[PDB]
Coordinates of C-alpha atoms and ligand atoms in Angstrom, one line a residue:
Chain A
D7 CA -0.3 0.0 0.3
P8 CA 1.2 3.3 -0.8
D9 CA -0.4 5.3 2.2
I10 CA 1.0 2.9 4.7
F11 CA 2.3 4.2 7.9
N12 CA 5.8 3.3 8.6
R13 CA 5.4 3.0 12.5
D14 CA 4.1 1.5 15.2
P15 CA 0.3 2.2 15.9
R16 CA 0.8 1.5 19.9
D17 CA 2.0 5.1 19.8
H18 CA -1.4 6.0 18.5
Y19 CA -3.8 3.6 20.8
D20 CA -3.7 1.8 23.6
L21 CA -4.9 -2.2 22.6
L22 CA -8.0 -3.0 25.2
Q23 CA -8.5 -6.6 24.4
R24 CA -8.1 -9.3 21.6
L25 CA -11.5 -9.8 20.4
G26 CA -10.7 -12.7 17.9
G27 CA -8.4 -14.3 15.3
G28 CA -10.4 -14.7 11.8
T29 CA -8.9 -16.0 8.5
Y30 CA -5.2 -14.5 9.4
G31 CA -4.0 -12.5 12.2
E32 CA -5.8 -11.5 15.3
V33 CA -8.1 -8.3 16.2
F34 CA -7.5 -6.2 19.1
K35 CA -9.9 -3.6 20.6
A36 CA -7.9 -0.2 20.8
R37 CA -8.2 3.2 22.1
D38 CA -6.9 6.6 20.4
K39 CA -5.1 7.7 22.9
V40 CA -5.9 11.4 22.9
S41 CA -9.6 11.4 21.2
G42 CA -10.9 8.6 23.2
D43 CA -12.2 6.6 20.3
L44 CA -12.3 3.3 19.9
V45 CA -11.0 0.8 16.7
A46 CA -10.2 -2.5 15.6
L47 CA -6.7 -3.2 15.0
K48 CA -5.6 -6.0 13.2
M49 CA -2.4 -7.7 13.0
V50 CA -0.5 -10.0 11.0
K51 CA 2.4 -11.5 10.9
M52 CA 4.6 -9.8 7.9
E53 CA 7.8 -11.5 7.3
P54 CA 10.7 -10.0 4.9
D55 CA 11.0 -12.8 2.6
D56 CA 6.8 -13.3 2.3
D57 CA 5.1 -12.9 -0.9
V58 CA 3.0 -9.5 0.5
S59 CA 0.2 -9.9 -2.4
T60 CA -2.4 -11.3 0.0
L61 CA -2.1 -8.1 2.6
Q62 CA -1.9 -5.9 0.0
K63 CA -5.1 -7.1 -1.8
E64 CA -6.9 -7.0 1.5
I65 CA -6.0 -3.3 2.2
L66 CA -6.8 -2.3 -1.3
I67 CA -10.3 -4.4 -1.1
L68 CA -10.9 -2.1 1.9
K69 CA -9.5 1.2 1.0
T70 CA -11.6 1.2 -2.2
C71 CA -14.8 0.3 0.0
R72 CA -16.9 3.2 0.9
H73 CA -20.4 1.9 1.8
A74 CA -22.2 1.7 5.1
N75 CA -22.5 -2.2 5.0
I76 CA -19.3 -2.9 4.5
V77 CA -16.6 -2.2 7.6
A78 CA -14.7 1.0 7.7
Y79 CA -11.0 1.3 7.0
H80 CA -8.8 4.1 8.6
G81 CA -5.2 3.5 7.5
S82 CA -2.3 0.8 8.1
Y83 CA 1.0 0.3 9.7
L84 CA 4.1 -1.3 9.0
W85 CA 6.7 -2.0 12.0
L86 CA 8.9 -5.0 12.7
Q87 CA 7.2 -7.4 10.6
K88 CA 4.2 -6.6 12.1
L89 CA 0.9 -5.5 9.9
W90 CA -1.9 -3.7 11.4
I91 CA -4.9 -2.6 9.7
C92 CA -7.2 0.1 11.4
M93 CA -10.6 -0.7 10.8
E94 CA -14.2 0.1 12.5
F95 CA -14.8 -1.1 15.7
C96 CA -18.5 -2.9 16.3
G97 CA -19.4 -2.4 19.7
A98 CA -21.7 -6.1 19.4
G99 CA -19.3 -7.9 18.1
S100 CA -20.5 -10.7 15.2
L101 CA -24.2 -11.9 15.2
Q102 CA -22.3 -15.5 15.7
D103 CA -21.2 -14.2 19.1
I104 CA -24.4 -13.0 19.9
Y105 CA -27.0 -15.6 19.2
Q106 CA -24.4 -18.1 21.2
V107 CA -25.5 -15.8 24.2
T108 CA -29.2 -14.8 23.0
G109 CA -30.5 -17.7 20.6
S110 CA -31.7 -18.0 17.9
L111 CA -32.7 -14.5 15.8
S112 CA -36.7 -13.6 15.2
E113 CA -37.5 -13.7 11.1
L114 CA -37.9 -10.1 11.2
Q115 CA -34.2 -9.7 12.6
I116 CA -33.2 -12.4 10.2
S117 CA -35.0 -10.1 7.6
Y118 CA -33.8 -6.9 8.3
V119 CA -29.7 -8.5 8.7
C120 CA -30.1 -10.3 5.1
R121 CA -31.6 -7.2 3.4
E122 CA -28.4 -5.2 5.1
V123 CA -26.1 -8.0 3.9
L124 CA -27.7 -7.9 0.3
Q125 CA -26.9 -3.9 0.0
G126 CA -23.3 -4.9 0.7
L127 CA -23.3 -7.6 -1.7
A128 CA -24.7 -5.3 -4.2
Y129 CA -22.3 -2.9 -3.5
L130 CA -19.5 -5.3 -3.5
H131 CA -20.6 -6.9 -7.2
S132 CA -21.3 -3.4 -8.8
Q133 CA -17.2 -2.9 -8.0
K134 CA -16.4 -6.5 -9.2
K135 CA -15.6 -8.1 -5.6
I136 CA -16.6 -10.9 -4.1
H137 CA -16.6 -11.5 0.1
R138 CA -16.2 -15.5 -0.6
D139 CA -16.3 -15.5 3.1
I140 CA -20.0 -14.7 4.1
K141 CA -21.4 -16.1 7.5
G142 CA -22.3 -15.2 10.7
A143 CA -18.8 -14.8 12.3
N144 CA -18.2 -12.1 9.5
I145 CA -21.3 -10.5 10.2
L146 CA -20.9 -7.5 12.8
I147 CA -23.2 -5.4 14.6
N148 CA -22.1 -2.1 16.0
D149 CA -24.1 -0.2 19.4
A150 CA -26.6 1.6 16.7
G151 CA -27.6 -2.2 15.8
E152 CA -26.3 -1.2 12.3
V153 CA -25.0 -4.2 9.9
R154 CA -21.3 -3.8 8.4
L155 CA -19.2 -7.0 6.6
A156 CA -15.7 -7.9 7.7
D157 CA -13.1 -10.2 7.2
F158 CA -11.9 -9.9 3.6
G159 CA -9.1 -12.5 4.6
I160 CA -10.3 -15.3 2.1
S161 CA -11.5 -12.5 -0.6
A162 CA -7.6 -11.3 -0.6
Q163 CA -6.4 -15.1 -0.9
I164 CA -8.2 -15.7 -3.9
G165 CA -7.6 -13.0 -5.5
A166 CA -3.8 -13.2 -4.8
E167 CA -3.5 -16.3 -6.0
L168 CA -5.8 -15.6 -8.9
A169 CA -3.2 -12.8 -9.8
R170 CA -0.1 -14.9 -9.2
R171 CA -1.4 -17.8 -11.6
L172 CA -2.2 -15.8 -14.3
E173 CA 1.5 -14.4 -14.8
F174 CA 2.1 -18.4 -15.6
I175 CA -0.9 -19.0 -17.5
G176 CA 0.7 -18.2 -21.3
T177 CA -0.9 -18.0 -24.6
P178 CA -4.5 -18.6 -24.3
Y179 CA -5.2 -19.4 -28.5
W180 CA -5.4 -23.4 -27.8
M181 CA -7.2 -23.1 -24.3
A182 CA -10.8 -24.8 -23.7
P183 CA -13.6 -22.0 -22.5
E184 CA -13.7 -24.3 -19.0
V185 CA -9.9 -23.7 -18.8
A186 CA -10.0 -19.8 -19.3
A187 CA -12.7 -19.5 -16.9
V188 CA -10.4 -20.8 -13.8
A189 CA -7.8 -18.9 -15.1
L190 CA -9.8 -15.4 -15.0
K191 CA -12.7 -16.2 -12.5
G192 CA -11.6 -19.5 -10.5
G193 CA -14.6 -21.5 -12.0
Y194 CA -17.3 -19.4 -10.5
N195 CA -18.9 -16.1 -9.6
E196 CA -20.3 -13.8 -7.2
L197 CA -23.4 -15.8 -6.9
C198 CA -21.6 -18.2 -4.4
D199 CA -22.0 -14.8 -1.8
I200 CA -26.0 -15.5 -2.5
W201 CA -25.8 -18.8 -1.3
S202 CA -23.4 -17.9 1.6
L203 CA -26.4 -15.7 2.8
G204 CA -28.9 -18.5 2.9
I205 CA -26.8 -20.5 4.8
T206 CA -26.5 -17.7 6.9
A207 CA -30.1 -17.1 7.2
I208 CA -30.2 -20.6 8.8
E209 CA -27.4 -20.3 10.9
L210 CA -29.1 -17.5 12.7
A211 CA -32.2 -19.2 12.9
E212 CA -31.1 -22.6 14.1
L213 CA -27.6 -21.3 15.7
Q214 CA -25.6 -23.4 13.3
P215 CA -25.4 -24.1 9.1
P216 CA -26.6 -27.2 7.9
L217 CA -24.5 -30.1 8.1
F218 CA -22.5 -29.0 10.8
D219 CA -22.0 -32.7 12.5
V220 CA -20.7 -33.9 9.1
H221 CA -17.0 -34.2 7.8
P222 CA -15.6 -30.7 6.5
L223 CA -14.3 -33.2 3.6
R224 CA -18.1 -35.1 3.6
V225 CA -20.2 -31.8 3.6
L226 CA -17.9 -30.9 0.3
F227 CA -18.2 -34.2 -1.0
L228 CA -22.0 -34.7 -1.0
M229 CA -22.2 -31.4 -2.9
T230 CA -20.5 -33.1 -5.7
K231 CA -23.0 -35.4 -6.0
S232 CA -25.5 -35.9 -8.6
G233 CA -29.4 -35.3 -6.9
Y234 CA -27.5 -32.8 -4.1
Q235 CA -30.7 -31.6 -2.6
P236 CA -30.4 -27.9 -1.3
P237 CA -30.9 -27.5 2.6
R238 CA -34.1 -26.1 4.2
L239 CA -35.1 -24.9 7.5
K240 CA -35.9 -27.6 10.0
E241 CA -38.9 -26.3 11.8
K242 CA -41.5 -26.0 9.5
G243 CA -44.5 -24.0 11.2
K244 CA -42.2 -21.5 12.7
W245 CA -41.2 -19.6 9.7
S246 CA -43.7 -17.3 6.9
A247 CA -43.9 -18.2 3.3
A248 CA -41.5 -15.7 2.5
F249 CA -38.8 -16.7 4.7
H250 CA -38.9 -20.3 3.4
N251 CA -38.6 -19.2 -0.5
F252 CA -36.0 -16.4 0.3
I253 CA -34.3 -19.7 1.5
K254 CA -35.4 -21.9 -1.8
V255 CA -34.4 -19.3 -4.0
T256 CA -31.0 -17.8 -2.4
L257 CA -30.5 -21.9 -2.1
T258 CA -30.7 -22.3 -5.9
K259 CA -28.3 -25.1 -7.0
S260 CA -27.7 -24.0 -9.8
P261 CA -25.2 -20.8 -10.2
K262 CA -27.0 -19.8 -13.7
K263 CA -30.2 -20.0 -11.9
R264 CA -29.3 -18.2 -8.9
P265 CA -30.8 -14.6 -8.2
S266 CA -28.4 -11.6 -8.0
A267 CA -27.7 -9.6 -4.7
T268 CA -30.0 -7.0 -6.7
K269 CA -32.9 -9.1 -7.5
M270 CA -32.9 -10.4 -4.2
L271 CA -33.3 -7.0 -2.8
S272 CA -36.7 -7.1 -4.2
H273 CA -37.7 -10.1 -2.5
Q274 CA -40.8 -9.8 -0.1
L275 CA -38.8 -11.0 2.9
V276 CA -36.2 -8.3 2.6
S277 CA -38.7 -5.8 0.9
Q278 CA -41.4 -5.7 3.6
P279 CA -41.8 -2.5 5.8
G280 CA -40.8 -2.0 9.4
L281 CA -37.1 -3.6 9.3
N282 CA -35.0 -1.0 10.7
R283 CA -32.0 -1.2 13.6
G284 CA -34.6 -1.0 16.4
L285 CA -35.1 -4.8 15.4
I286 CA -31.4 -5.2 16.3
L287 CA -31.5 -2.8 19.2
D288 CA -34.6 -5.5 20.5
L289 CA -31.4 -8.4 20.2
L290 CA -29.0 -6.3 21.6
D291 CA -31.1 -5.7 25.4
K292 CA -31.5 -9.7 25.4
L293 CA -27.6 -9.8 25.0
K294 CA -27.4 -7.2 27.8
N295 CA -29.9 -9.2 30.2
Chain B
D7 CA 13.5 -38.4 -9.3
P8 CA 14.3 -41.9 -7.2
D9 CA 16.6 -42.9 -10.2
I10 CA 18.1 -39.9 -10.8
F11 CA 22.3 -39.8 -12.3
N12 CA 24.1 -37.7 -10.2
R13 CA 26.6 -36.3 -12.7
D14 CA 27.2 -34.1 -16.0
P15 CA 25.4 -35.9 -19.0
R16 CA 28.5 -34.0 -21.0
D17 CA 30.4 -37.0 -19.5
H18 CA 28.2 -39.2 -22.3
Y19 CA 27.3 -36.5 -24.5
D20 CA 28.3 -34.1 -27.1
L21 CA 25.5 -30.8 -26.8
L22 CA 25.8 -29.8 -30.6
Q23 CA 22.7 -26.9 -30.9
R24 CA 19.9 -25.4 -29.0
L25 CA 16.5 -26.9 -30.2
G26 CA 14.7 -24.2 -28.2
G27 CA 13.0 -23.1 -24.8
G28 CA 9.6 -24.3 -23.8
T29 CA 7.3 -23.7 -20.9
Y30 CA 10.7 -23.7 -18.8
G31 CA 13.9 -24.5 -19.6
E32 CA 16.1 -25.3 -23.1
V33 CA 16.2 -28.0 -25.1
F34 CA 19.3 -28.8 -26.6
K35 CA 20.0 -31.5 -29.5
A36 CA 22.9 -33.8 -27.9
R37 CA 24.9 -36.9 -29.7
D38 CA 26.1 -39.9 -27.8
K39 CA 30.2 -39.9 -27.3
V40 CA 30.6 -43.7 -27.7
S41 CA 27.1 -44.9 -30.1
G42 CA 26.7 -41.6 -31.9
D43 CA 23.3 -41.8 -30.9
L44 CA 20.9 -38.6 -30.9
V45 CA 19.1 -37.6 -28.0
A46 CA 17.6 -34.3 -27.1
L47 CA 18.1 -32.9 -23.8
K48 CA 16.0 -30.5 -21.8
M49 CA 18.3 -28.2 -19.3
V50 CA 16.4 -26.7 -16.2
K51 CA 18.7 -24.7 -13.9
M52 CA 17.6 -25.3 -10.3
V58 CA 11.2 -28.6 -6.9
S59 CA 7.7 -30.4 -7.2
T60 CA 6.9 -29.2 -10.6
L61 CA 10.3 -31.2 -11.9
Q62 CA 9.2 -34.3 -9.9
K63 CA 6.1 -34.3 -11.6
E64 CA 7.1 -33.4 -15.1
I65 CA 10.1 -36.8 -14.5
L66 CA 7.4 -39.4 -13.3
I67 CA 4.9 -38.2 -16.0
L68 CA 7.8 -38.9 -18.9
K69 CA 9.0 -41.8 -16.7
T70 CA 5.5 -43.8 -16.6
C71 CA 4.7 -43.5 -20.1
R72 CA 5.2 -46.3 -22.5
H73 CA 3.5 -45.6 -25.9
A74 CA 4.8 -44.5 -29.3
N75 CA 3.2 -41.1 -29.4
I76 CA 4.9 -39.8 -26.6
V77 CA 8.2 -39.0 -26.3
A78 CA 10.5 -41.8 -24.9
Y79 CA 12.1 -41.0 -22.0
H80 CA 15.9 -41.9 -21.3
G81 CA 16.7 -40.5 -17.8
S82 CA 17.5 -37.4 -15.8
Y83 CA 21.0 -36.0 -14.7
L84 CA 21.3 -33.8 -11.6
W85 CA 24.9 -31.7 -11.5
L86 CA 25.8 -28.4 -10.3
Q87 CA 22.2 -27.1 -10.0
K88 CA 21.6 -28.1 -14.0
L89 CA 18.8 -30.8 -13.9
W90 CA 18.8 -32.5 -17.5
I91 CA 15.9 -34.6 -18.9
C92 CA 16.8 -36.9 -21.4
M93 CA 14.4 -37.8 -24.4
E94 CA 13.3 -38.9 -27.7
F95 CA 15.1 -36.6 -30.7
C96 CA 13.2 -35.6 -33.6
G97 CA 14.9 -35.0 -36.3
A98 CA 12.2 -32.7 -38.4
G99 CA 11.4 -30.6 -35.3
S100 CA 7.8 -29.3 -34.5
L101 CA 4.8 -29.4 -36.6
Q102 CA 4.9 -25.3 -36.3
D103 CA 8.8 -25.5 -37.3
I104 CA 7.5 -27.7 -40.3
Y105 CA 4.6 -25.4 -41.6
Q106 CA 6.6 -22.0 -41.0
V107 CA 8.8 -23.1 -44.2
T108 CA 6.0 -25.2 -45.8
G109 CA 2.7 -23.9 -45.2
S110 CA -0.5 -25.1 -44.9
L111 CA -1.0 -29.0 -44.3
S112 CA -3.1 -31.0 -46.5
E113 CA -6.6 -32.5 -45.0
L114 CA -4.7 -36.1 -45.3
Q115 CA -1.7 -34.7 -43.6
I116 CA -3.7 -33.4 -40.8
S117 CA -5.9 -36.4 -40.5
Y118 CA -2.9 -38.7 -39.9
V119 CA -1.3 -35.9 -37.3
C120 CA -5.0 -36.0 -35.2
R121 CA -4.9 -39.8 -35.3
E122 CA -1.7 -40.5 -33.8
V123 CA -2.6 -36.6 -31.3
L124 CA -5.5 -39.1 -30.3
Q125 CA -4.0 -41.9 -29.8
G126 CA -1.2 -40.3 -27.6
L127 CA -4.4 -38.4 -25.7
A128 CA -6.2 -41.8 -25.3
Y129 CA -3.0 -43.5 -23.6
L130 CA -2.3 -40.6 -21.2
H131 CA -6.0 -40.0 -20.2
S132 CA -6.1 -44.1 -19.5
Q133 CA -3.1 -42.9 -17.2
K134 CA -5.2 -40.0 -15.4
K135 CA -2.7 -37.7 -17.2
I136 CA -3.7 -34.4 -19.1
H137 CA -1.2 -32.7 -21.4
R138 CA -3.3 -29.0 -21.3
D139 CA -0.9 -27.7 -23.9
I140 CA -1.7 -29.5 -27.4
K141 CA -0.5 -26.9 -30.3
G142 CA 1.5 -27.4 -33.3
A143 CA 4.9 -26.2 -31.3
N144 CA 4.1 -29.6 -29.1
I145 CA 3.8 -31.8 -31.8
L146 CA 6.9 -33.4 -32.9
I147 CA 7.9 -35.4 -35.8
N148 CA 10.9 -37.7 -36.3
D149 CA 13.3 -38.7 -39.3
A150 CA 10.7 -41.4 -40.2
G151 CA 7.4 -39.1 -40.4
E152 CA 6.3 -40.2 -36.8
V153 CA 4.2 -38.5 -34.1
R154 CA 5.3 -37.6 -30.6
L155 CA 3.4 -35.1 -28.1
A156 CA 6.0 -33.3 -25.9
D157 CA 6.3 -30.6 -23.1
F158 CA 4.8 -32.0 -20.1
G159 CA 5.8 -28.5 -18.5
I160 CA 2.3 -27.2 -18.2
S161 CA 0.9 -31.0 -16.7
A162 CA 3.9 -30.6 -14.2
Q163 CA 2.7 -27.0 -12.7
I164 CA -0.9 -27.8 -12.6
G165 CA 0.1 -31.3 -10.6
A166 CA 2.5 -29.5 -8.6
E167 CA -0.3 -26.0 -8.0
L168 CA -2.7 -29.1 -7.6
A169 CA -1.0 -31.1 -4.7
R170 CA -1.0 -27.8 -2.3
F174 CA -10.1 -26.0 -0.4
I175 CA -9.6 -23.2 1.5
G176 CA -13.0 -21.8 3.2
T177 CA -15.2 -22.9 5.4
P178 CA -17.4 -26.0 3.6
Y179 CA -20.6 -25.2 5.6
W180 CA -21.4 -21.8 4.1
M181 CA -19.5 -22.8 0.6
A182 CA -21.5 -22.5 -2.7
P183 CA -21.6 -26.0 -4.6
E184 CA -19.9 -25.2 -7.8
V185 CA -17.1 -23.5 -5.2
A186 CA -17.0 -27.3 -3.5
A187 CA -17.0 -28.9 -7.4
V188 CA -14.2 -26.2 -8.6
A189 CA -11.9 -27.7 -5.3
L190 CA -13.2 -31.6 -5.6
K191 CA -13.3 -32.1 -8.9
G192 CA -11.4 -29.8 -11.2
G193 CA -12.7 -26.3 -13.0
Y194 CA -11.9 -28.6 -15.8
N195 CA -10.9 -32.7 -17.3
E196 CA -8.9 -34.3 -20.0
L197 CA -11.5 -33.0 -22.4
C198 CA -10.0 -29.7 -22.5
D199 CA -6.8 -31.9 -24.5
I200 CA -9.8 -32.5 -26.9
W201 CA -10.7 -29.1 -27.6
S202 CA -6.9 -28.0 -27.9
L203 CA -6.9 -30.5 -30.9
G204 CA -9.8 -29.1 -32.6
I205 CA -7.6 -25.8 -32.5
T206 CA -4.1 -27.7 -33.4
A207 CA -6.2 -29.1 -36.8
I208 CA -7.3 -25.4 -37.5
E209 CA -3.4 -24.2 -37.0
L210 CA -2.4 -27.3 -39.1
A211 CA -4.9 -25.8 -42.0
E212 CA -4.3 -22.4 -41.6
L213 CA -0.9 -21.4 -39.9
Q214 CA -2.4 -19.7 -37.3
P215 CA -4.9 -20.4 -34.3
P216 CA -8.0 -18.8 -34.4
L217 CA -8.3 -15.1 -32.7
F218 CA -4.1 -15.2 -33.0
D219 CA -4.2 -11.4 -34.2
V220 CA -6.2 -10.8 -30.7
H221 CA -4.9 -9.5 -27.7
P222 CA -4.3 -12.8 -25.2
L223 CA -6.5 -11.2 -21.9
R224 CA -8.7 -10.2 -24.3
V225 CA -9.1 -13.7 -25.6
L226 CA -9.8 -15.1 -22.2
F227 CA -12.1 -12.4 -21.9
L228 CA -14.6 -13.8 -24.9
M229 CA -14.0 -16.9 -23.7
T230 CA -15.3 -16.9 -20.3
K231 CA -18.3 -15.0 -21.6
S232 CA -21.5 -17.1 -21.9
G233 CA -22.6 -17.3 -25.8
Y234 CA -19.0 -17.6 -26.8
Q235 CA -19.1 -19.0 -30.4
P236 CA -16.3 -22.4 -31.3
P237 CA -14.4 -21.6 -33.6
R238 CA -14.8 -22.6 -37.4
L239 CA -12.5 -23.3 -40.4
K240 CA -12.2 -20.1 -42.5
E241 CA -12.0 -21.8 -46.2
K242 CA -15.2 -24.0 -46.2
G243 CA -14.6 -24.9 -49.9
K244 CA -11.5 -26.1 -49.3
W245 CA -12.1 -28.7 -46.8
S246 CA -14.4 -31.6 -46.7
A247 CA -17.4 -32.7 -44.7
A248 CA -15.6 -35.0 -42.4
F249 CA -13.1 -32.4 -41.9
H250 CA -16.2 -29.7 -40.8
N251 CA -17.6 -32.4 -38.6
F252 CA -14.1 -33.3 -36.7
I253 CA -13.5 -29.1 -35.9
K254 CA -17.4 -29.0 -34.9
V255 CA -17.4 -32.2 -32.3
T256 CA -13.7 -31.5 -30.7
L257 CA -14.3 -27.8 -30.6
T258 CA -18.0 -28.6 -28.6
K259 CA -18.3 -25.5 -26.2
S260 CA -20.3 -27.7 -23.3
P261 CA -16.9 -30.5 -21.4
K262 CA -20.3 -32.8 -20.9
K263 CA -21.2 -33.3 -24.5
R264 CA -17.3 -32.8 -26.0
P265 CA -16.2 -36.2 -27.4
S266 CA -13.3 -38.4 -25.8
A267 CA -10.1 -39.3 -27.3
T268 CA -11.4 -43.0 -27.6
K269 CA -14.4 -42.2 -29.1
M270 CA -12.6 -39.6 -31.5
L271 CA -10.7 -42.7 -33.1
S272 CA -13.8 -43.9 -34.8
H273 CA -14.4 -40.6 -36.3
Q274 CA -14.5 -40.5 -40.2
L275 CA -11.8 -38.6 -40.7
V276 CA -8.9 -40.4 -38.6
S277 CA -10.6 -43.7 -39.3
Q278 CA -10.3 -43.9 -43.2
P279 CA -7.5 -46.0 -45.1
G280 CA -4.5 -44.6 -46.3
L281 CA -3.4 -42.8 -43.1
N282 CA 0.4 -42.9 -42.8
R283 CA 3.4 -41.3 -41.8
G284 CA 4.5 -41.4 -45.7
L285 CA 2.0 -38.3 -45.8
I286 CA 4.6 -36.6 -43.6
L287 CA 7.4 -37.5 -45.6
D288 CA 5.8 -36.2 -48.1
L289 CA 5.5 -32.9 -46.8
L290 CA 9.1 -33.1 -45.0
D291 CA 10.1 -33.4 -48.8
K292 CA 8.4 -30.3 -49.7
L293 CA 10.4 -28.4 -46.7
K294 CA 13.9 -30.3 -47.8
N295 CA 13.4 -28.0 -51.5
Ligands
LIG301 C1 -15.0 -13.0 17.9 N1 -15.6 -11.7 18.2 C2 -14.9 -10.6 17.4 C3 -15.7 -9.2 17.6 C4 -16.2 -9.0 18.9 C5 -16.3 -7.5 19.5 O1 -16.8 -7.5 20.5 C6 -17.2 -6.1 21.0 C7 -16.2 -6.1 18.4 C8 -15.5 -6.8 17.2 C9 -14.9 -8.4 16.8 C10 -14.7 -8.0 15.2 N2 -14.4 -6.9 15.0 C11 -14.0 -6.2 13.6 C12 -13.8 -5.3 13.4 C13 -13.7 -4.7 12.3 C14 -12.9 -5.4 11.2 C15 -12.9 -7.0 11.9 C16 -12.3 -8.0 11.2 N3 -11.3 -7.5 10.0 N4 -11.2 -8.8 9.5 C17 -11.5 -9.9 10.5 N5 -12.0 -9.5 11.4 C18 -13.1 -10.2 12.4 C19 -14.5 -10.6 11.9 C20 -12.3 -11.7 12.7 C21 -12.9 -11.7 14.4 F1 -12.0 -13.1 14.8 F2 -12.4 -11.0 15.4 F3 -13.6 -12.4 14.3 N6 -13.4 -7.3 13.2 C22 -15.1 -5.9 15.9 O2 -14.9 -4.7 16.3
LIG302 C1 11.5 -25.3 -31.6 N1 12.1 -26.1 -32.1 C2 12.1 -27.5 -31.2 C3 12.5 -28.6 -31.8 C4 13.4 -28.5 -32.9 C5 14.1 -29.4 -33.5 O1 14.5 -28.9 -34.9 C6 15.5 -30.8 -35.6 C7 14.0 -31.2 -33.0 C8 13.6 -31.0 -31.7 C9 13.2 -29.8 -31.5 C10 12.4 -30.1 -29.8 N2 12.6 -31.4 -29.9 C11 12.1 -32.2 -28.5 C12 12.4 -33.7 -28.2 C13 12.2 -34.1 -27.1 C14 11.2 -33.1 -26.2 C15 11.9 -31.8 -26.1 C16 10.9 -31.2 -25.2 N3 10.4 -31.5 -24.0 N4 10.2 -30.4 -23.3 C17 9.9 -29.5 -24.4 N5 10.3 -29.8 -25.6 C18 9.8 -29.2 -26.7 C19 9.0 -29.2 -27.2 C20 10.1 -27.5 -26.7 C21 11.0 -26.4 -27.8 F1 11.1 -25.6 -27.5 F2 12.1 -26.9 -28.3 F3 10.0 -26.6 -28.8 N6 11.9 -30.8 -27.7 C22 13.6 -31.9 -30.9 O2 13.8 -32.9 -30.9

């Protein structure tokens, strides 16, 4: 990055506590020594012979995002083989941290979250970005009940490995169209995000994604099989017809048939009136007591 | 390599002339000091890529795949000893000779398909079929060479990254199965047949990054032969079937060996010897 600070951020902030890990490195809650403003500081070990391409891609994605539903980016610091990414602190943490105390979210709470996640996804996809890691752990809630997408770690690793491999591609004139597709897009597109959101809606309703108790390799294997059935909500009478259909269209097995984020935004579940932050303020009141 | 010779090959061979580059490294013509026998020596400066390459070559025992004689390692230089092909690549040839005849193309395609049927039966993929990688020996025989891309894919594959529970099925598909299979070689053979007929692959005058973008863009149309009247209905059909856009519908190498173009009588090395006589004058 060109605007990186060649100094230790602990000269400007005090590390209050560790917030978690993530795809790579760790996140600390930090306080600005002068202003008293809270920030999230993500620290990663940046060795002298390391590639650099992944961290460069991650800060590029964050730096070029200017949307309410994507975590704000403040700046980056490089010091003594440690890279620090300064981002917006989200007071209630992740939806996963929340539902683990609170229990399953209500349909209206899931609906506001889905609409906020879809707004962030429509923004990302419009500027040729893919999150690729949509899940409860990556959806953050600030004190105002606002929703922000975080952890572009998986996205950065893929973007870096795709650029790296595009150098060793060679001439394409003899390449089959499917070979061209894995070289340029990895063999899939941004609609993988729409499916992840559908799994996230179930995760929020049932406290775990479908097949959580099945071997990670076996779940991948079952998806590769013919006659693979997309997951569904367990408790049939707990949820409205709009919620069941939202799950049905987001979890369309074929990406050619799966709706885009913009189309999804006009779905009855996320288009309904009365979806606002107040629904999430009620969730946070339950977190506090 | 477990069978590598830990000495300089220039103890046994005299380096005669550089034949070319290729995916990686350089290829030299070499002559055995005592027997006078000719070999091709592929020299690579210095790990899993080269291991996967020696293994692909060592485990091939088929007439239409360049014969492997062994490997040498001395002072950070790895040397791969293979069959020397006196007439060079089909690209070296057609650049002097001009377009191949339909019968010459048909024989070349049958030979390449025989080599591809063998590779696919061993679960190997060439992934770099083109005129420059199709070699011709002095007898007019056809051999597939440069397993550099295949080795680089193999090594890259050897080293999924997300969390499977939120992963879309097409994402899981590209991780377990590949984003493509061995039928990509069948398409590459269709392009090579056009290249042998026209002296260049389709869209050769278009920027490579642009070419990649037209291909991924749905509604991309498979290429065809430019001079419709010069070629037979069987040759036009062979181009149509090898260049099927859908990997599920594209015929296999053994299926293509029953196609009228490559099944016809009178397909022999003599057709290529007629071509080499044209090169000689
Ligand atoms: C386990 N609870 C997390 C937690 C609990 C909490 O409680 C008050 C507050 C926060 C977090 C995280 N966070 C934050 C803020 C900005 C970016 C990122 C980020 N950028 N890259 C990966 N991350 C996160 C998702 C990784 C990881 F592992 F921390 F979640 N995180 C908060 O402001
Ligand atoms: C440009 N003319 C080449 C040329 C001209 C020639 O004239 C009499 C003879 C030969 C060659 C090549 N060759 C050979 C033989 C075995 C393997 C390999 C090989 N193994 N890995 C990549 N290759 C080749 C395809 C790469 C490259 F760049 F050399 F073509 N090559 C010959 O016997």
